[PDB]
């Protein structure tokens, strides 16, 4: 067949979109993905008959699926669909602009070529969300307020066109346009950033103009004007442009003065909320709605100064001696620049650009050229040397940090990564029985061997050991192979001997202590090893307990002071389906029978209902302070973060706004469940000023979501600063999004650029050693600190220590005396309008 | 299912091939790539259900698909079928010959298994080429001419057949064959290369012998005769006869003479152009259709002689003693040999050997031998430690350059290896905003990465820095750190200051600058552009101005001298769906709305019909000297090789032969547009000596086509001397061909193999500061010179430099007043034939 | 005395009686590059505070007397990232005439004194015997 | 087995070696003046030769290692350039296994003089009062 990677790549979208038939032709109401790959199959199908022209399929497109065809989010998520075909003429691109045009679809076209019955429309069976719908109160925002201004009349002399953009020095215009030079000098169109004015041939328009800011310096165009704004610079320029010929025409009378937050001064440029959103994306005051989910974002604040955004493209705000500064020492331009960024972070919901250097967060403000703008600092300048990744209209947040990983498999850090998370912590040295069950890396030689195997891979990598013994020998030997934590996992033994000489040692070394207790109570019961805890900071995993631990108690952690509790994720949240589902998860996985009442009881003892649910509610109000995996060991990897979510989506349905949130939107509850799969992992493990939040100084590991797909399927994820994995289409498209769209691996994964984006986290008794050296790692090693002091406290957002009670018969739990009922969810957000299974 | 690698892609294959019976099942006429992936399909359905033996389906396979089920170019390009499955009685072989036998197929065969309705044969719709066909002159050649010759009975006396190739010693064979040895002293076969003559026990052939050339060294087989031929070693020879038992009777009246070019000399043996094209590749004067496309290349000349073709394979040419030399020294074997390669090269076409020593290309003409062969040089010497990879039959080219790449994902360097491509020129960071619209890779860390992260791919690449800034200040630090030239794009500003500064900085850099202009005409128009470049060398991207440029006048720059002028190819040609397709593609990509009248009046300012078809004309011609992909950012990078040949194609159809053009050939043409993705890309950016021809002395970087599929898919891609990617099926397969065949990665392209077959190009700034050094680079770095000294009378057969002119308001474009007309193409080659989809 | 001699002037070579005769000086007098406390490689002065930091020399040999084969001149001399990469008139364009862009004194930019010296090209020893490695230390 | 080998001149053998040859390259060796014509004048010293600069020492030579150090590759662990082995065979053998030394006799001290007997033989030497390969060699 001699096949070429495209054809591969278009064989597997043709198979999407059969699926997507097939289930169409039962009457199934097709969601997003599977809408997407059936339209696109069918242009290629439809090109491959070579009866249909490129404009006649942009056309039939619309007229395969109907909105009752498809889920009712779908025509809000679905604007277009683009796919490359062979055509009869060579290779084309299709794009079908808004697909889901009709009531009923064209079926026997939808079906085309695909030999499936055709269904009756009956067939399709009957008020949801807008997916990351963008709420704005009516009204208007007033641009460049402030500056002076003057309107001018503009005449073209030229006979082709000529567009001017809104930060272009008007002075520097092309010759052929006419009109009073004199006026222009310093000032720029005062219209909305990156937008345009177009000038046909003989055309006169008026235009405002506003006097350019910052240290008011001209650079760039053609040179006529160069130098700081003064009237020694005036006069030269107005000489270069008689000199070079450069069209200027004194308009004495030009109606001059000042715009302000004035809606009558007729200097002033207005925009309304709802197209500065569709432009630049949200600004103060405006809700997103995240994904599918209950959840309304309330930009808090914004560091944007309206009519300066930076805007890059043609014709806009990023480029030379505009947005893009000429005039500042190389070395301080910044590496990228994200701009206009919708950020969430347990800090705070904003608007702002985002500077990284050196792979790490330069700074978060308002980006741009000093030059010509107010408000730029020298820490967030764009230069030549600057790459510019555009934020608006998208949301960033820290990549997702899941401490509760098992590394069975490789495959798993692909799901995770392409999930949006950018650090692992746990225990593993492949599927082996001792790693399916626990998150250990026993010995020096594995500990080198996994550190020296995903030395390569673009996140950042901590390995725990082994804690369950009941000498120190052994457990100073793996920290200082590389190990920067412990494991305590009754699979090894979890008994108070075990578990004192463990945190012991964790005192010396200054690592964190992760357990999975005693669920036999075999050595004692809950209360046994919180004793042996001796008050010393440990990290509790599952602290639910359906993951593991003393049965059926194991949740009385999460009021305890010096512990960090956390939970896996396949207990988020408690659904109709949970509880038959980890029953039998569990039986299968230690091979019980239910015939066997011994083994029924067990089970029993470990599943249940209400600490699940009692989990729903302890999440919260801040009583867990950590969601991670448990990565295929009772958990999923690439839905830590959908799972938090999900979460919160519940619990604001069924008790709505949370003590502490504004009635206006979730943004304290936002805050307080994002912190569970970021800044908070990085402070219970100890790398929390490298990692975990959307702050200066940080490493840049951050991740681009469409509102609409929050929480579900990022965007990109930038590692270190470099792109390391994101959505790209066909390869050999002549543009970047035709389909099939994947989350795939990027640059930063090649050659050893994953090693200089990233850090491997040890211990420090490791770095005194330097097994960095040792190991000949290319990958940035750092010791782990300051996880001895900590405690429920410490945990941002979540620092809630209720006194929980468990009812020995029952299981009825209760939070300071009061009961934590949480009837099971039927549905959750993030899933049936996402997945294709 | 622990599914194995092997049945993982037969599921593909499997689904390939019901693709292909749901599209027979609604009377689509397949093509080749379609009948291959039913016919293997239906095979394995067939093991699979155990009724049918190997022999048994290779005949039900001929019976499957009948001419009027296929294309017509189909039963030529349809030689055989090949596919593995498991049989009742364990994985079996099943080759198909000549599938497409009959007129209609058994149709419900070739559905078996898809539970599919069989459709009725009136479904099927009803003169074009032979893919690939060679044009021989009905004419026979002669072997062998000028060597002593004498005709012997041979007999057998063994009881097992003996077989002796055409360059074996005759005095060495075999004891068991009796005749005079003495008359064959020094003798060989005068047959074609590569074939044998076969004695069965008892049988008595007679043979004519010719003498064998060059030093006349006897070496190998019995080492009866070792030495040079001469009277004291064939006494020594005859003793050892006699001694040794070898079979020895005295024909005194054996004819004796000397082979001449004489049709009616007894001892000459002649082939027919036809069987020698069939066994070595065409010869001198043979001509080659290029694909399915109507371009015909002639061999200008062939450096064999005939009869001692260097052909490898049990029995044949390249063996110790014959073809395969063993009396020189062992640092001057080649390390490999290209035998009997058609070289399509802008230098020419021709039939060569073609030699490969550390990586590079050693040598050019007959190889071999010299101890039997004449013409063989100290530098073409197969030897013990040389590899052979065969020619014969196959086009080797120079691997293709692709000059203006954005490195927006790594997935488009694989396809673009897989087409034909071994050096990328171009700039990106990943998918950043900044790389998706230009060729740039703006600050030093990110060059640093880049190099680092590509640094284990194997092809030669060159990444470009961001020139739009009017000072010089950082453009030294991008250079510095590693950047091959810069690129001035409107989106980061091409102003005149700008350009002049870039320029200037290119002056002393000595790097290339490539540039995207103001299509706004913002600063100016076209002539300001050019007048800022002040007559300095620069090269112009998308010169057309589809991709970009001075609105609608651009294209102007192709009469500039001192402008090296590329297009880029989705308007390559111009075809019935090229407007419509590129008018929408633009405004997706720039988010015009239709019914916003300044938003359409841009975009058909900027995509004309006039100058596209201009485009067509100024390729032909020669007054555009390259063509690049633009990938993803407007362009394909698997396309840059076959949209050159579509256009020539279209060109030879609409204008017929080239005023340089012989007409009994398309060489000059063809010679024209090879030079522009393969030397024209190297001269443009300065690397020249190193890549971009098949010289002695530069880089072996080649690629393999089968004339059938040439310039569309290739056999295999050398790198550095060493397979990178190549066409292969089920790895665990018997052999190589068997389905699913597609293009993989080799040994090329694991561990750091990449970079020692590769070189990393940088400034020479760069390499004064040892950035291969700094970075820890294992691929070769060398600097890139001699480029601002360039103009387009340097750009190989594509130095064209007409007075071009744009009517204002029609667009008409005319080259020294003479318009350059060219209706478009309904259908292209290339294309249909090929793709699966 | 102060900047080592000068066109027409003679030096001799040793003690032996071989006199060599400065051809040309880039140097415009008064304007001499010598380092030195309140002397003219400083800030603003003789050392450029006006250029990008990527042209600065990494080294400058100020008023040496240069005798190689290609002739016997008075000159500053330029080095970048081990190379020579000018020879001529140093210092810096703001304050100076005749000073080319890769002639550059910047910040970044290390002085050796050369006036009242000679610079010559190291020498090229061609018939070595690698008998011991002390004598690659004599040698250089 | 390795080229480790020493030139002696009959004359000062095991006293002042000529040279020491390490892995089959000169590693030290009598050498004179660097500067002179010949090797021979004074002043004649051993010195260290091409086998001791740069990382040709590790090239020329072995660090053993037990078998467990071998089996952790500590080589690689300590970026080692020299050649590393593991030793072995040590643990089976007897005073019979070291060549023409594998003398067993029986040993007594007596308590109060001292006295050695082996196999009840008196071991009665007495002291030297010169030495060779001594005054006549030595400067101090
Ligand atoms: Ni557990
Ligand atoms: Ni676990
Ligand atoms: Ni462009
Ligand atoms: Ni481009």
Known sequence: MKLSPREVEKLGLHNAGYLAQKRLARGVRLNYTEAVALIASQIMEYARDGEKTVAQLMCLGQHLLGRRQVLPAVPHLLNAVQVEATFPDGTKLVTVHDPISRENGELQEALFGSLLPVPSLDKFAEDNRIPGEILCEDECL??????????????????????????????????????????????????????????????????????????????????????????????????????????????????????????????????????????????????????????????????????????????????????????????????????????????????????????????????????????????????????????????????????????????????????????????????????????????????????????????????????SSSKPDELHEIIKAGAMGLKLHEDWGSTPAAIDNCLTIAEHHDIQINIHTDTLNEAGFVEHSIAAFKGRTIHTYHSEG???????????????????????????????????????????????????????????????????????????????????????????????????????????????PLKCDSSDNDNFRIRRYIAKYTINPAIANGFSQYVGSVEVGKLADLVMWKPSFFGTKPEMVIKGGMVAWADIGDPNASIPTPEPVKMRPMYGTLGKAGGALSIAFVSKAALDQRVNVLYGLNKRVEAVSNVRKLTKLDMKLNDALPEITVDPESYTVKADGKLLCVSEATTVPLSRNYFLF
Chains 1, 2 share one sequence.
């Open 546 to 656: 359906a993951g593991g631990g003393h049965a059926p108690d194991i949740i009385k952690v999460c009021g305890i002071k010096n512990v960090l509790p956390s939970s896996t994720n396949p207990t988020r949240p408690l659904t109709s389906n949970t509880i038959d589902e980890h029953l039998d998860m569990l039986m299968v996985c230690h091979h019980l029978d239910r015939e066997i009442p011994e083994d029924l009881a067990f089970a029993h003892s470990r599943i249940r209902k209400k600490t699940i649910a009692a989990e729903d509610v302890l999440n919260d109000i801040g009583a867990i302070s950590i969601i991670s995996s448990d990565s295929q060991a009772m958990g999923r990897v690439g839905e830590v973060i959908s799972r938090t979510w999900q979460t919160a989506d519940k619990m604001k349905a069924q008790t709505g």
């Open 142 to 467: 007033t641009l460049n307020i402030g500056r002076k201004a003057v309107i001018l009349k503009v005449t073209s002399k030229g006979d082709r066109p000529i567009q001017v953009g809104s930060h272009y020095h008007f002075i520097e215009v092309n010759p052929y346009l006419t009109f009073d030079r004199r006026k222009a000098y310093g000032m720029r169109l005062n219209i909305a950033a990156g937008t345009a004015v177009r000038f046909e041939p003989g055309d006169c328009k008026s235009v405002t103009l506003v006097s350019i800011e910052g240290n008011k310096v001209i650079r760039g165009g053609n040179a006529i004007a160069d130098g700081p704004v003064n009237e020694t610079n005036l006069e030269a320029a107005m000489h270069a442009v008689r000199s070079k010929g450069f069209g200027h025409e004194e308009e004495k009378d030009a109606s001059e003065g000042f715009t302000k937050e004035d809606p009558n001064c007729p200097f002033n440029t207005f925009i309304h909320r709802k197209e500065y959103a569709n432009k630049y994306g949200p600004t103060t005051g405006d809700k997103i709605r995240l994904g599918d989910t209950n959840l309304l974002a309330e930009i808090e604040k914004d560091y944007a100064l309206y009519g300066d955004e930076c805007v890059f493209g043609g014709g806009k705000v990023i480029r030379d001696g505009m947005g893009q500064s000429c005039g500042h020492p190389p070395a301080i331009s910044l590496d990228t620049v994200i701009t206009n960024a919708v950020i969430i972070d347990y800090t705070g919901i904003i608007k702002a650009d985002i500077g990284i250097k050196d792979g790490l967060i330069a700074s978060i403000g308002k980006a741009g050229n000093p030059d010509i703008m107010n408000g730029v600092f020298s820490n967030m300048i764009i230069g030549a040397n600057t790459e510019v990744i555009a934020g608006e209209g998208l949301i960033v947040t820290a990549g997702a940090i899941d401490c509760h990983v098992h590394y069975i498999c490789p495959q798993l850090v692909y799901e995770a990564i392409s999930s949006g998370i950018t650090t692992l912590v746990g225990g593993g040295t492949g599927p082996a029985a001792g790693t399916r069950a626990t998150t250990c890396t026993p010995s020096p030689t594995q500990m080198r061997l996994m550190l020296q195997s995903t030395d390569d891979l673009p996140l950042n990598f901590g390995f725990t050991g082994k804690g």
